[PDB]
DNA sequence: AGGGACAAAGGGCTTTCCATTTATT
């Protein structure tokens, strides 16, 4: 053997979500889907920044955006679609033999666990992050191939076994192993209260007027699709000293917290992906980690 | 005898709007004539022309500043620096609802053409986006200019793109005549001699630069001849209108 | 300006009118065109870490070479062959394909894979023209990041950002 | 030792109030609710500045907003909801090494003293700030999880001891010491008199034709939600030479008086927070000051 | 037949250079 990696590898995104929408309904009548519009308010506060104690007697005027439920309704509705696309072993760039000897060494993995966790992240409502916190009772409705399901309450942190998720997981794992696609329409109902606050996605913008801006399609509040795609890829529980699931990254990096878990101890992607090619047998978990990175996709430079 | 297929209200989410280094907005016509060639390779239907509208379009971000997408670490040897954010390179995003119209010749039954289009729409991407919702296509037949009006008015809510031509250059024309450009072709500069990094290994390669033109967004029900609203390949690495300059 | 020309040629010192550093910073692909230089065509220049030298006024080589059409004046050879040979030995070709878009195009009975690169004249002429002629439908965007000293001298000298055309179509109410 | 704080730290809100609503009811009939709408009037008084004595003869004309009770009703009703969210030590931005070693130093604080005052500021009627002045009798009704409490007369400047506020404080402290949430529904009744003046929250406007613009929700007079939350956390009586309670703030500053009570004498939040991480022993009374700042939230980064 | 030498290719860490001119609806 003694074969080295090409300069650029490229794998597409096998899990395609769309940007969700926000609606205000009632827990009784879930048909009055009124949109939730983004306003603009101006608020007077104090500075109180670290240091600069000399300027601790003045006020700062700040303009922000906001999105609240109206006082007549008390239920948040979130609508989006999720598409699962198979053929996860075809390369886009830098195929050669490097991809074939990796495909023939990773054809005996556990797609059932990966599909079960990918569905269970949608089922538990991990795609909400501030909308889930404070809600009394959540209710998820999944429509896949004219077979409607409904869930009541799941535990977000621990992957608990149940017979409802296993059917959809077995449907997904047949697509991810062979060829084809499967689309599922997901609706989420949250009971919050009369006049509560909902939380859309915040922009990475440099506007000179607003201190905070929220994402909106034609005025109605929404979340980013690449934001929603992070919760599905939160399946990584196999890193060293594992406590909580993290997102699937090639270095296992959470830049929000400022630490990198998987990198630095010969456990990242670019060691295991060479060891699997060069004949070394892997454990059951780092065979799943590489395949989860392939389902995530991405380019990989030299 | 020419046939037409029309798809209405195609929701695309996450289109990278950087068409060139000086134009950020709608994707150009070359994307939509590449989409027809992609359909011709994947399905088998020979497509010679393509028209397109714009029901809704919105580039995300503020008015004069577009938003930046966050980046993740995707490179070999970036272990030491992985805890810190990332270097950031520019690419904007946009969200829109479009209407597409092809011009095919099929010479067969019409109840399998819709199925062949629908088997492709669920797979492909419109300029790197994600197709969320689309209406069922239908087949239209026109013979002369009197029967052509039917296929023109079929897609009523629309804003088609017609050619306008360049007078001297894009900057002075944009300032004087109030028009916004679109790349309609590429000019090649120098052949790449080492093809071990290309994605074909057999096709010859050339470094190229964009070449611009000026366009006009027009109501589809206020166009006299429909052939000025079509786009096709043909010229030296370039696209052009069938019915000439409007 | 020979004392600055030899200092720029003692460095890396490349001169181009078509590059790929305006798309991705990690590119290092430089193209100089012969058929496009004219009486007002402005070019760009790259050296490692954007290292330069002043001329007892605050001007580097890039600020001198674009003012009063000096680049054509050395290029046409009206300042002698003492500096024209040094100018012609400066602009060389530098070809790289990594981290760039590669698309196909339909030629006559076949395909052609091609790589779009950026234009150095268009960016500078666009920013310096639309401002004076009061065109207020643009996007102001700076490239280089926190340290713009890594792409081009034209990145470093004007930090205010280039102007890009807005191409947002109107929509149906 | 001597670990520095990370450059990005963030703490979310743990107290979520909603924007209040105003209604007009009679004192002996608590169900005939009608809206208090906002109108516009034009006033023609004189002008007087501490400059320009020459222009003391020209009556200026102003256009203001106003809201009053009708002449057949004499009781103002204020309605809002307050939500208390637990897990007050988990950081949003910023990981461990700092918040984890701050949690083990702020573990043994007295949550009962904080949770008593946070409910006593709602029960006494400090959440009104102009409708309290000139009222014959106030009456507050607090509803939590099918349990109703009524409060008639409570001193505001003094934190008195009674038997019914401590029944809610033991529920609030259980949420603030653990995980979960609890919801209070608060209704205030004040007997002002027929045709009296009610006071909504003003709005920050820039050069409007109106000299005074009031906040409104679909034409009904309301109060700002961040104005409601300022009255709840007015619990701070631990600064040097303490006379009256002020709001919880890292510099203890009020912008009306133009003075910072806590800043400038090595007593502020950032000096106290860095000392507690490095191993210094905090006083029993300013441990609740640092803990109240994490409930408020904000930015604490270099 | 196999540790040891002979020299390469990755990889962490440590510099390093380096400066505008803001209206737009």
Q: What secondary structure does DSSP assign to chain B, as a single string?
A: --EEEEEEEEEEEEEE-BSSSSEEES--HHHHHHHHHHHHHHT---EEEEEE--SEEEESB-SSSBPPPP----BTT-SSTTSS--------EEEEEEEEEEEE---S-STTHHHHHHHHHTT--STT-EE---PPPEEEE--SHHHHHHHHHHS-S--EEEE---SS-HHHHHHHH---EEEEEEEEEEE-S--SSSSSSSS-EEEEEEEEEEEEEE-GGG-S-GGGG-EE--STTB-EETT---
**How many CB atoms neighbour CB B80 within 10 A?**
11
- Residue C72 has φ and ψ, to the nearest 5°, of -70, -30
The candidate with the shortest Cα–Cα distance to A284, out of A111, A168, A119, is: A111
The answer to whether the CB of C52 falls within 8 A of the CB of B228 is: no
Question: C-alpha distances in angstroms, A297 versus A179, C122, D197?
Answer: 17, 35, 64
**How many CB atoms neighbour CB B77 within 10 A?**
9
Residue D103 CA distance to nucleotide E11 C1' (Å): 38
**Residue keyed to tokens 């990242």:** A268
Q: How many CA atoms lie within 13 A of C37 on its CB side?
A: 20
Cβ contact C156 with chain E strand, < 7 A: yes
d(CA A142, CA A163): 15
DSSP for residue C150: G
**Residue keyed to tokens 């904000």:** D298
Question: C-alpha distances in angstroms, C158 versus C126, C128, C162?
Answer: 13, 11, 9
Q: Smallest Cβ distance to A260: which of B83, B130, B132?
A: B83
d(CA D13, CA D88): 9
Question: C-alpha distances in angstroms, C85 versus C18, C88, C91?
Answer: 21, 5, 11
Distance from CA of A283 to the nearest CA of B (A): 22
- Residue D138 has φ and ψ, to the nearest 5°, of -110, 150
d(CA A147, CA A185): 11
The candidate with the shortest Cα–Cα distance to D19, out of A34, A135, A71, is: A71
d(CA A274, CA A289): 14
Contacts of A257 by beta carbon, 8 Å cutoff, 6+ apart: D94, D95, D96
- Residue A34 has φ and ψ, to the nearest 5°, of -85, 140
The answer to whether the CB of C149 falls within 8 A of the CB of C49 is: yes
Two tokens at D170? 């033991």
Cβ contact C34 with chain E strand, < 7 A: no
- A-chain residue closest to B72, CA distance: A249
The candidate with the shortest Cα–Cα distance to D47, out of D57, D36, D35, is: D57
Two tokens at A287? 């065979």
The answer to whether the CB of D208 falls within 8 A of the CB of D186 is: no
The candidate with the shortest Cα–Cα distance to A125, out of A135, A140, A137, A115, is: A140
| H or E segment to which residue A230 belongs | helix A225-232
| H or E segment to which residue D43 belongs | strand D39-43
d(CA A218, CA B58): 8
d(CA D295, CA D88): 6
d(CA A299, CA A8): 7
DSSP for residue C50: G
d(CA D137, CA D188): 11
Two tokens at C95? 């070809």
Instruction: List chain E nucleotides near protein: any atom < 7 Å from a Cβ.
Output: 10-13, 16-25
For chain D, say whether A211 makes contact (Cβ under 8 Å).
no
Q: Are strands C44-46 and C14-16 parallel, antiparallel or unpaired?
A: antiparallel
All residues of chain C having their beta carbon less than 8 Å from the beta carbon of residue B189 are: 18, 31, 33, 117
User: Rg for chain C (alpha carbons), in Å?
Assistant: 18
DSSP D57-120: S----EEEEE-B--TT--EEEEEEEEEEE--TT--SBS-TTTHHHHHTTSTT--HHHHHHHHHH
The sign of the dihedral angle between the CA atoms of A112, A113, A117, A123 is positive
Two tokens at A146? 């004219």
User: Rg for chain A (alpha carbons), in Å?
Assistant: 22
Q: Smallest Cβ distance to C105: which of B56, B64, B186?
A: B186
Two tokens at C100? 């760039």
Crossing angle of the two packed helices D287-296 and D111-123, in degrees rounded to 10:
60
Question: C-alpha distances in angstroms, D176 versus D87, D124, D295?
Answer: 7, 21, 9
The answer to whether the CB of D141 falls within 8 A of the CB of D168 is: no
**Strand runs labelled E in C36-141:** 44-46, 103-107, 110-116, 118-119, 138-141
**Strand runs labelled E in C3-58:** 14-16, 18-19, 30-31, 44-46
List the Cα angle A289/A293/A294 in 5-degree steps. 120
Question: C-alpha distances in angstroms, D78 versus B202, D131, D151?
Answer: 77, 10, 15
The answer to whether the CB of A132 falls within 8 A of the CB of A138 is: yes
Burial bucket for residue A161 (CB in 10 Å: 0-12, 13-18, 19+): exposed
DSSP for residue C169: P
The answer to whether the CB of B244 falls within 8 A of the CB of B226 is: no
The answer to whether the CB of D140 falls within 8 A of the CB of D122 is: yes
Two tokens at A31? 């048909």
Residue A191 CA distance to nucleotide E11 C1' (Å): 53
Burial bucket for residue A208 (CB in 10 Å: 0-12, 13-18, 19+): exposed
Cβ contact B84 with chain E strand, < 7 A: no
d(CA B233, CA C105): 9
CB C113 to CB B198 under 8 A? yes
Cβ contact C164 with chain E strand, < 7 A: no
3-state DSSP assignment of residue D131? coil
Two tokens at B112? 């399998």
Question: C-alpha distances in angstroms, D46 versus A103, D42, D52, D55, D59?
Answer: 87, 13, 13, 10, 4
Residues of B at the A interface, defined by Cβ within 8 angstroms: 11, 13-14, 56, 58, 60-63, 65-70, 72-80, 82-86, 95, 122-123, 130, 132, 197, 199
Q: What is the dihedral of CA A12, A15, A16, A19, to 10 degrees?
A: -130
Q: Are strands C162-167 and B23-25 parallel, antiparallel or unpaired?
A: parallel
3-state DSSP assignment of residue D271? helix
d(CA A85, CA A179): 8
Cβ contact C104 with chain E strand, < 7 A: no
Two tokens at C26? 């990690």
d(CA A89, CA A82): 20
The candidate with the shortest Cα–Cα distance to B27, out of B14, B39, B38, is: B14
Question: Measured in Å, how far apart are chain A's first and last C-alpha atoms?
Answer: 20
d(CA B240, CA C16): 31
Q: Smallest Cβ distance to B73: which of A17, A18, A253?
A: A253
Q: Give Cα D151 distance to the centre of its chain.
A: 19
Contacts of D117 by beta carbon, 8 Å cutoff, 6+ apart: D159, D235
The answer to whether the CB of C32 falls within 8 A of the CB of C45 is: no
The answer to whether the CB of D293 falls within 8 A of the CB of D248 is: yes
d(CA B167, CA B174): 10
Contacts of D18 by beta carbon, 8 Å cutoff, 6+ apart: A68, A193, A194, A195, A196, A197, D80, D81, D82, D225, D228
Two tokens at A14? 């096998």
Q: Give Cα A37 distance to the centre of its chain.
A: 24
3-state DSSP assignment of residue D46? coil
Contacts of D179 by beta carbon, 8 Å cutoff, 6+ apart: D86, D87
Q: Are strands B205-218 and C110-116 parallel, antiparallel or unpaired?
A: parallel
The answer to whether the CB of A202 falls within 8 A of the CB of A215 is: yes
Q: Give Cα D71 distance to the centre of its chain.
A: 31
Cβ contact B83 with chain E strand, < 7 A: no
Contacts of C109 by beta carbon, 8 Å cutoff, 6+ apart: none
**How many CB atoms neighbour CB A108 within 10 A?**
8
List the Cα angle B230/B231/B232 in 5-degree steps. 130
Please, which chains are in contact with A (at least 3 CB pairs closer than 8 A)? B, C, D
The candidate with the shortest Cα–Cα distance to D188, out of D28, D94, D75, is: D75
Two tokens at A164? 């409802």
d(CA A132, CA A118): 18
**Residue keyed to tokens 């989006």:** A80
Burial bucket for residue C82 (CB in 10 Å: 0-12, 13-18, 19+): exposed
């Amino acid at each position: 053997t003694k074969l080295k990696a090409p300069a650029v590898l490229a794998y597409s995104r096998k899990i395609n979500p769309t940007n969700a929408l926000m609606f205000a309904v009632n827990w009784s009548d879930r048909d009055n889907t009124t949109a939730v519009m983004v306003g603009t308010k101006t608020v007077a506060g104090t500075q109180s920044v670290r240091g600069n104690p000399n300027d601790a007697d003045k006020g700062n005027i700040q303009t922000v955006n906001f999105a609240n439920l109206p006082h007549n309704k008390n239920t948040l509705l979130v609508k989006y679609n999720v598409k699962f696309v198979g053929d996860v072993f075809k390369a886009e760039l830098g195929g050669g033999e490097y991809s074939n000897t990796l495909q023939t060494a990773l054809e005996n993995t556990d797609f059932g666990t990966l599909a079960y966790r990918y569905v269970y992240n949608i089922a538990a409502g991990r795609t909400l992050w501030r909308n889930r916190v404070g809600a009394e009772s959540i209710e998820t409705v999944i429509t896949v191939n004219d077979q409607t399901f409904t869930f009541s309450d799941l535990l977000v942190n621990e992957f608990d076994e149940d017979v409802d998720v296993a059917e959809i997981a077995d449907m997904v794992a047949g697509v991810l192993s062979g060829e084809g696609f499967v689309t599922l329409k997901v609706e989420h109902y949250m009971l919050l209260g009369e006049g509560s606050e909902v939380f859309p996605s915040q922009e990475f913008v440099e506007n000179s007027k607003l201190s905070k801006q929220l994402f909106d399609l034609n005025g109605q509040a929404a979340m980013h699709d690449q934001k929603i795609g992070n919760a599905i890829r939160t399946i990584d529980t196999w890193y060293e000293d594992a406590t909580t699931p993290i997102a699937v990254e090639p270095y296992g990096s959470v830049v929000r917290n400022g630490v990198a878990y998987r990198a630095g101890n010969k456990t990242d992607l670019f060691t295991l992906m060479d060891g699997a090619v060069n004949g070394k047998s892997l454990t059951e978990e780092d065979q799943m980690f590489v395949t989860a990175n392939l389902i995530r996709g991405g380019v990989f430079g030299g | 005898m020419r046939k037409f297929i029309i798809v209405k209200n195609v929701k695309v989410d996450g289109i990278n709007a950087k068409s060139s280094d000086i134009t950020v907005g709608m994707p150009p016509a070359t994307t939509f004539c590449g989409l027809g060639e992609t359909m011709s390779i994947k399905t088998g239907i020979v497509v010679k022309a393509v028209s397109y509208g714009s029901v809704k379009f919105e580039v995300r971000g503020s008015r004069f500043n577009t938003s930046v997408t966050k980046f993740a670490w995707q490179d070999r040897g970036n272990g030491g620096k992985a805890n810190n954010n990332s270097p950031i390179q520019p690419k904007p995003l946009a969200d829109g609802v479009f209407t597409l119209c092809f011009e095919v010749e099929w010479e067969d039954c019409a109840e399998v053409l819709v199925d062949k289009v629908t088997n492709f729409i669920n797979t492909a991407r419109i300029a790197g986006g994600t197709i969320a919702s689309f209406n069922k296509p239908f087949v239209k037949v026109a013979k002369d200019a009197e029967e052509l009006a039917s296929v023109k008015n079929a897609m009523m809510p629309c804003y088609v793109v017609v050619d306008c031509g360049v007078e001297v250059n894009i900057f002075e024309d944009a300032v004087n005549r109030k028009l916004q450009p679109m790349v309609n072709g590429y000019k090649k500069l120098e052949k790449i001699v080492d093809n071990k990094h290309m994605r074909d290994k057999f096709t010859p390669a050339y470094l190229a630069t964009p070449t611009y033109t000026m366009i006009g967004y027009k109501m589809v029900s206020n166009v006299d001849n429909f052939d000025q609203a079509l786009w096709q390949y043909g010229e030296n690495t370039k696209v052009k209108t069938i019915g000439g300059i409007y | 300006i020979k004392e600055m020309i030899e200092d720029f040629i003692s460095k890396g010192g490349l001169i181009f009118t078509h590059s790929g550093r305006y798309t991705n910073t990690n590119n290092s692909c430089f193209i100089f065109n012969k058929n496009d230089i004219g009486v007002d065509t402005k070019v760009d220049m790259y050296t490692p870490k954007s290292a330069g030298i002043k001329n007892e006024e605050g001007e580097n080589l890039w600020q001198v070479l674009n003012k009063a059409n000096m680049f054509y004046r050395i290029y046409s050879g009206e300042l002698g062959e003492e500096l024209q040979y040094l100018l012609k030995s400066c602009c060389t070709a530098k070809e790289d394909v990594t981290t760039l878009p590669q698309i196909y195009f339909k030629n006559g009975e076949g395909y052609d894979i091609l790589v779009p690169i950026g234009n150095a004249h268009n960016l500078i002429s666009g920013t310096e023209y639309l401002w004076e002629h009061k065109y207020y439908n643009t996007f102001t965007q700076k490239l280089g990041g926190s340290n713009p000293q890594n792409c081009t001298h034209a990145c470093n000298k004007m930090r205010g950002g280039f102007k890009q055309f807005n191409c947002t179509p109107p929509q149906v109410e």
